[PDB]
């Protein structure tokens, strides 16, 4: 069965990017909505919209790619080069304010589910709180 919905979304997005689809569909959840909102704010994806697939609520994610390239293999550069799940069921990862990771010298972002909702590494450090390290994106 489906054990980790968040990992499911991460893999879905990765698989969508790797084949250059304009949009993808995912089962609906509030926490997933929050994650996608964070991603959209940081300009990783073109944006999300709540839709309905044959009765069931879904979210359609519109993806963003780079410009068409030259030479052999003209496939554009990805905007999401690498997305990884940190805290998984069976081994949860919790970090304090002092242990918040820096991803790619600030070129990347990390998602923290803290007491004050879902934040990036920057804003989590700003508000001076720690939480659960959901995933890293760069």
């Amino acid at each position: 069965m489906l054990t980790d919905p968040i990992a499911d979304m991460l893999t879905r997005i990765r698989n969508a990017t790797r084949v250059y689809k304009e949009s993808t569909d995912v089962p609906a959840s509030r926490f997933k909505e929050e994650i996608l909102r964070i991603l959209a704010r940081e300009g990783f994806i073109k944006g999300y919209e709540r839709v309905d697939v044959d009765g069931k609520p879904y979210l359609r994610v519109y993806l963003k790619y780079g410009p068409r390239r030259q030479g052999p293999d003209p496939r554009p550069e990805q905007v999401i080069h690498h997305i990884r799940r940190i805290s998984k069921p069976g081994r949860r990862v919790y970090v304090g304010v002092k242990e918040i990771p820096r991803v790619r010298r600030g070129l990347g972002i990390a998602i923290l589910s803290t007491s004050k909702g879902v934040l990036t590494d920057r804003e989590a450090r700003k508000l001076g709180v720690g939480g659960e390290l959901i995933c890293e994106v760069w």
């Binding site: 030479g71 052999p72 003209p74």
Partner: protein, 220 residues
């Protein structure tokens, strides 16, 4: 539209052959055949034609690549009615990545052509003359039209991107923009400026190439 419809441009190949990557250009399916969306064809044609017009105005060089059985004569006639070179017999592997080597053959053909029109041919007895005749005939058949290229071209025009995949690869490797008259069984991603049309149906190729060459001539 109204000029493309009668030429059978919008008639593709069967369901058996269609390349998935081309699906974005399919209008609908009827009678076990695929249909290309006329509208999309129209704006793609507009874009590519604008590019070709600009390149012609700047004084660029375009190479014509059509080898398919029915397209040989069309390519020949359409190319001759312009300064642009062409390849219409068979794409020798390495006309671009190995341009120098083929230029050696161009030089050889030039030297032979000069020799046969010289009053020094009274040497080299009849049999050697016949051998040289055979050599000259072969080089003329294969290397005609290509002789115009003093250097690397500025763009490439291909009738079928799949049949002439080697030429596409070479052009991609040497940063040469590609113009293709693709169909249902082609890869859109490998062509910078694509015309979704037909590769069979002499009428379609005639129309497209005639329009292209007229645009070339007009912009000079």
């Amino acid at each position: 539209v109204k000029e493309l419809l009668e030429a059978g441009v919008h008639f593709g190949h069967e369901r058996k052959r269609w390349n998935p990557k081309f699906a974005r250009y399919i209008y609908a399916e009827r009678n076990g055949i695929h249909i290309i969306d006329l509208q999309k064809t129209m704006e793609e044609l507009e874009r590519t034609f604008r590019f070709i017009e600009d390149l012609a105005m700047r004084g660029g060089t375009i190479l014509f690549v059509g080898t398919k059985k029915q397209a040989q004569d069309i390519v020949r006639m359409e190319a001759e009615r312009a300064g642009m070179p062409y390849v219409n017999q068979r794409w020798l592997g390495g006309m671009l990545t190995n341009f120098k080597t083929i230029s050696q053959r161009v030089h050889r053909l030039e030297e032979l052509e000069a020799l046969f029109a010289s009053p020094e041919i009274e040497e080299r007895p009849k049999k050697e003359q016949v051998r040289l005749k055979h050599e000259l005939e072969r080089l003329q058949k294969y290397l005609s039209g290509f002789r115009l290229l003093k250097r690397l071209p500025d763009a490439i025009f291909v009738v079928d991107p799949t049949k002439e995949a080697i030429a596409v690869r070479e052009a991609r490797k040497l940063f040469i923009p590609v113009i293709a008259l693709a169909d249902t069984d082609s890869d859109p991603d490998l062509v910078d400026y694509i015309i979704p049309g037909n590769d069979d149906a002499i009428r379609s190729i005639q129309l497209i190439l005639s329009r292209a060459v007229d645009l070339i001539i007009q912009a000079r």
